[PDB]
Amino acid sequence: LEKTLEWIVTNDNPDKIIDRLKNLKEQDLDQLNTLIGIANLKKVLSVWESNKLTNTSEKFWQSVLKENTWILSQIFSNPTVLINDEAYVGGKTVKNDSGKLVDFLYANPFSKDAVLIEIKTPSTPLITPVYSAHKDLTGAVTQVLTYKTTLQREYQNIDYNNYRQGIKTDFDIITPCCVVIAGMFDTLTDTAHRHSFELYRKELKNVTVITFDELFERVKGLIKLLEG
Amino acid sequence: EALEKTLEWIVTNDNPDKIIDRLKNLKEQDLDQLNTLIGIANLKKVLSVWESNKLTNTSEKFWQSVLKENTWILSQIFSNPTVLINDEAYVGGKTVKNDSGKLVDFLYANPFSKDAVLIEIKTPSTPLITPTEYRTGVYSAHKDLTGAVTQVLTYKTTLQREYQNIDYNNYRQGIKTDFDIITPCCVVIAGMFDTLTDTAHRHSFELYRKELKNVTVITFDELFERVKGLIKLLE
Amino acid sequence: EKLIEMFESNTDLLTQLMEDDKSEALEKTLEWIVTNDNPDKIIDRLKNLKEQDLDQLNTLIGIANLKKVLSVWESNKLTNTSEKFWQSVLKENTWILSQIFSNPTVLINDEAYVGGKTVKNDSGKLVDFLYANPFSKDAVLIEIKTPSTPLITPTEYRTGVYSAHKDLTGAVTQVLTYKTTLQREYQNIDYNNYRQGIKTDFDIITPCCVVIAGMFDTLTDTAHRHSFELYRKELKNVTVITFDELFERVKGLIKLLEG
Amino acid sequence: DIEKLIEMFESNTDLLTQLMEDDKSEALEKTLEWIVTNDNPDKIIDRLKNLKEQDLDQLNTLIGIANLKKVLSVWESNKLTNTSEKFWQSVLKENTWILSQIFSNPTVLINDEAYVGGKTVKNDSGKLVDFLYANPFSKDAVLIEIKTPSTPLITPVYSAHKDLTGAVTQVLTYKTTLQREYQNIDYNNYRQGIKTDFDIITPCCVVIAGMFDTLTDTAHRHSFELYRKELKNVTVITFDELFERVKGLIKLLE
């Protein structure tokens, strides 16, 4: 098995391999894709388990989550993911010719909406000693809302410029979703902190705040669903 | 022999756990390249089938079977691991077999999430708008599309009511329950978009399509445009 | 002058003059109130009355208007099947429509009705009037059909599933087209104003759309009602209402005012 | 006497016109009092129906404008002295049709009571949800919380005051309770076999706060605007903005 997998990856003509693969039944290709996805999920879970208690750098976690965007698409139910002014579709980076993400979004064939994700460290505090939310959370929420507003305004301008050329007279409106990945939920030992945090999350208008623990519980749930 | 038979052995193994463990221990680049190759092959096969049979075959069952054989691609396109087609459940390639025989029982104990995708599949020759105009420059949608939308909504309502019955039974039993209503997503695959040649037809169709609250309407042209885009991205 | 001198010396004269049906003093007085050229003085006089008298007068007038509309519907609900007739009937009573749908501005057949009077905008453009509205920049778009308009297709798409009739869908599409045209012209006005250095926030106005359709009594079996309710509850911005529900609201308002 | 008066009035319409026009003779007020205080209102209602529909609409418009002006005068008189919450609650309850016009909903919920068309909708059972489920006038309703104009708005950047947050929480709790009871009633109706569709109610929440003039510096205004913009389901309106809307409606209808 190992030698066959080594030979598949390292070969002269990938096109010949693809042509030989196309002769298989679709039910075999689906199960192969499912097994590869399960392997990727287990690898990500092991990586999180190894570095849970040590790494506190935002860059490491941002890179880890950017390497696995399809898991985020499955979790948040949208094939388009926007991280730091870049669009990921099907695990690949969409490279627009011009330096304008809105140009790609307006002509996007895959979906009409996207998901805006802001990624922090698991060490970010959540509550301050009812109780008030920490600054590191509200700053991220405000930043994501500002980015969403800018995207919507530019999309409206592009649509109006399209209208005046006679191409169309109908309205195209974009409403992205905002997600903020906060730190860890287990630190809220006392009931007061949990109650305040739950109320704060319930009061948010257009932003969904999720911790790392809940995210990887979701990862475990997806592993159990696919594997079962 | 060295390629096809080995993969057939991989698929037909009693204990997939060993295979998954062996795959996990591989290097990241090898696994990524293998995933890319398999995805490209599957997408290309589906696109070849579409290109071969997009002008002649006009049977609902043919297209329903064709799309049911590729549930992984549908789940990737619509971003949901659970797909429901004609009272059946597919989780990433395989059919869900229920010993109890009830789909709501399976949906109730779902570990990932309780929301799924309801897909209604028609032929690519389904009319989109009524030929005769209602008034000058105004066209009404064809009755086939409205009937399909109503069918999907009826099925969703039945699912929600059965889930509510299960929840109330559990509450009466004694287990603490929350009475929130589940909201699955509804998709209808209509015919061809290129048959709308003049501005009025496209305007009326877009006005009808953008007014729906919970239902999505897709043509075969746009679906396989997405397939072509994925193929182009993976290369 | 001499008439006022006589009236200062007697109250029974005025009381009997109002009581006598042949004199018709009451109707002439009300017509003089309606057609006077100085509404400001009349409004100032009305404001100085007691609250009880003003409320009683308002109740009586509202009851009379609602009863007149209900009598018209009861007379013509089974015979007349002309769309123009019902459009005119509902245009005669725009105040009741504003009270029912809670919006002082009503748009029917590309015309604006405020205070039961047609807005005689000097400019040919209605969006110019909507742009300078001092209360709000929204309005209600109303599409009026006959009470004999079919609601669902007579045949069934499948076992127990019925699709909507093309007349209703055509009406909804017409209302949406009109709303889109209004929004685009408003955007044009906003951009033209911004081009001249006037700070304008580029917000899109969202008026409300109402479609009046046939009768709910024709949906006898449960399948028809189920299909119609499934169709009607999926529209995002358009409200579909039948004549039966509208005049049930009218009857409810009459019952509330009388009680 | 009476017959001579009738004949003289019939001979000259100008006499009847001038009798009403002249300010010295209070013919108009006497006529209105005779209309209001008549023993038999049914005959008056039958007589009024004879007049055209446009005349009735214009009379209703005039009476509405008079009511709006009276309410505006009441606001102008007591906006600085009176500070009783019950006073303002009664003032706003007596004029619910203005609120319905402003917030675009025919049903108004104030202090666990329903107002439709300016009249209190009396329900047989002591259950508002029973009326709301069988309400023939609209689908949803509006929940209104009425504070005083002296209510503080900001905490001495800045943050929202305690009273405003408490009012918002109270309104949200009431809305949640109403939604839960409505859903339970709908499920019981489904289980009886009457229907199978879903009936979902989504009430709107409005809080009437104090005055906007107190926010002098730019920081306070910016903080308050941000707080209002970030609210999820509640709309906060001050008395000054409410009566500016009243002035706008008066200008529009006239």
From Swiss-Prot, chain A:
Name of protein: Shedu protein SduA
Keyword Nuclease annotated: yes
What this protein is reported to do is described as:
Only component of antiviral defense system Shedu. Expression of Shedu in B.subtilis (strain BEST7003) confers resistance to phages phi105, phi29, rho14 and to a lesser extent to SPP1. May be an endonuclease.
Q: Which GO terms describe its biological process?
A: defense response to virus
Name the keywords, alphabetized.
Antiviral defense, Hydrolase, Nuclease
The gene it comes from is sduA
For the keyword Nuclease, the answer is yes
Return one GO MF term: nuclease activity
